């Protein structure tokens, strides 16, 4: 069969990939503390009564409804309407 | 020159083709509907004029509406005609390509080196009253490694230009003799 | 990591603690800066031991 | 020219080499040169 040389490797590696993305979409109710966006960068900058933290995360600040937003010369945004 | 014409409707594209007639479209500042015509005669006419000269399509509506072509979108696979666009003429400012006529065999040519042209049609704005059939331009004595561009070409008065015109119109370059096998070394 | 070393901070007047870290290469001697005690209020805290 | 340690001004001359009596004003008070 002739098993002489065979060029090995040093490549195969990845990541215990955490699940990142828009956790809570619009029309969704939050009790504050519920995070709506797990992102790496700021693809979703804070909205009204939505906060951000150390890992760039849009989470809830009240009990209302997630509302989506875009602002070309300012970025994309995710908010929470009051529901009083 | 003359071709027929046919008012199109809400009939499926594929069928019109695999029946007998290629489909089309026309638009001018405001006038936009859908149209179509025969294949074989259309192909005949096109092979002459196309986006060089003027078309005149007498349409089953009573008139004889004359257009230019514009864009020849095809199927690419086994490439061949399949729906064009038409441009309803007038007298207003319009850019379009004019097929040019490189006349006369230069000195770069006959020395061996052959013309490797750039264009065979130049973009130029004109009033639709001027018909620059074809600028039968010079190319009297192009040399090898020699070029010509800009407003160098004669332009029929009125028929303006529409590039830079530093757009190089053409040039002559070396052949490819068997001495290019010695290059293989 | 070790050789750059780690240390805890201790108050004055006897005890009060926290859990921090150091670094030697920069001409650093007595690591000394503010914090808070369990009992009472704001105090210094001096570098100490392991 | 505010700040503080600013190296000053004051009038200077130019007792040149042509009988020249030039009126100047600079950091040093007694300047004289050539032309």
């Amino acid at each position: 069969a002739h098993k002489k040389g065979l060029g090995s490797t040093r490549n195969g590696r990845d990541s215990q990939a955490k699940r990142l993305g828009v956790k809570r979409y619009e029309g969704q109710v939050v009790r504050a503390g519920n995070i709506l966006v797990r992102q790496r960068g700021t693809r979703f900058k804070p909205g009204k009564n939505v906060g951000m933290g150390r890992d760039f995360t849009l989470f809830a600040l009240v009990d209302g409804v997630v509302e989506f937003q875009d602002r070309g010369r300012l970025g994309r945004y995710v908010h929470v309407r009051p529901l009083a | 020159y003359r071709l027929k014409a046919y008012y199109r409707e809400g009939e499926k594209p594929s069928a019109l083709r695999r029946a007998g007639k290629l489909p089309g479209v026309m638009y001018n500042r405001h006038l936009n509907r859908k149209v179509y015509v025969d294949l074989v005669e259309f192909d005949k006419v096109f092979r002459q004029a196309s986006i060089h000269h003027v078309i005149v399509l007498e349409l089953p509506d009573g008139q004889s509406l004359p257009t230019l072509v514009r864009q020849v979108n095809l199927d690419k696979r086994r490439r061949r005609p399949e729906h064009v666009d038409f441009f309803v003429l007038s007298d207003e400012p319009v850019e379009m390509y004019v097929p040019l006529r490189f006349v006369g065999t230069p000195a770069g040519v006959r020395a061996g080196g052959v013309l490797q042209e750039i264009h065979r049609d130049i973009l130029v704005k004109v009033s639709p009253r001027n018909i620059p059939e074809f600028i039968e331009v010079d190319v009297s004595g192009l040399e090898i490694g020699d070029s010509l561009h800009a407003s160098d070409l004669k332009l029929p008065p009125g028929v303006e230009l529409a590039v830079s015109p530093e757009e190089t119109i053409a040039a002559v370059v070396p052949p490819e003799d068997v001495e290019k096998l010695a290059e293989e070394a | 990591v070790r050789i750059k070393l780690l240390l805890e901070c201790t108050e004055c007047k006897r005890r009060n603690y926290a859990t921090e870290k150091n670094k030697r290469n920069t001409p650093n001697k007595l690591e000394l800066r503010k914090y808070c005690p369990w009992c009472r209020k704001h105090t210094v805290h001096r570098e100490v031991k392991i | 020219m505010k700040e503080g340690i600013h190296p000053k001004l004051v009038p200077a001359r130019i007792i040149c080499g042509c009988g020249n009596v030039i009126e100047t004003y600079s950091t040093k008070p007694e300047i004289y040169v050539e032309v």
Binding site: - | - | - | P7, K8, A12, E23, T24, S26, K28, I31
Partner: protein
């Protein structure tokens, strides 16, 4: 409002000649003067400390004011100090003391340059300014042999309202600049 030769003669020669020749129809539009800046690029302070900055203040201490040193950008391993903290001398001059510079410039600095056929014209921005310098440093008034170590050049500048060449040169005929032409 401390007036001297170049300032007063700025008023007198400039206004008429300038407008009557070039046609300026605006009080604050006349191709006046703006800042005048001097600069020293010494790559010698790779180390050297501010013992060689004593030579840097030396430069601006004879021009009147207190100099400010800057530094450098990125890596020049081919020629040492990269990180960018050796020396970069700059001083900006407004009206009055700027007029001091221009004065001492035209009066005595230029004289004892031996090979002086006049200044280098072509060095005009085109967008409307002028940039040069010199070699022999001690040509300046308040500095005799003692101060300097060996040799040291300099890079001056002149910022002006000037938008063309000729108006700038004429501006330097009314403000009087010894050219080679």
């Amino acid at each position: 409002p401390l007036d001297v030769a170049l300032k007063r003669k700025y008023y007198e020669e400039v206004r008429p000649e300038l407008i009557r020749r070039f046609g300026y129809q605006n009080v604050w539009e006349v191709p006046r003067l703006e800042k005048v800046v001097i600069n020293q690029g010494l790559g010698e302070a790779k180390e050297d400390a501010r013992i060689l900055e004593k030579a840097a203040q030396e430069l601006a201490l004879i021009t009147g004011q207190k100099p400010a040193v800057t530094r450098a950008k990125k890596s020049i391993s081919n020629f040492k100090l990269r990180k960018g903290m050796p020396i970069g001398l700059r001083v900006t001059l407004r009206r009055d003391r700027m007029w001091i510079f221009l004065e001492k410039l035209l009066n005595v600095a230029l004289p004892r340059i031996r090979d002086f056929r006049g200044l280098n014209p072509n060095s005009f921005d085109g967008r409307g300014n002028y940039n040069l310098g010199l070699r022999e440093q001690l040509i300046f008034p308040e500095i005799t042999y003692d101060m300097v170590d060996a040799l040291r050049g300099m890079d001056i500048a002149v910022v002006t309202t000037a938008e063309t060449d000729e108006e700038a040169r004429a501006l330097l005929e009314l403000l009087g600049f010894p050219f080679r032409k």
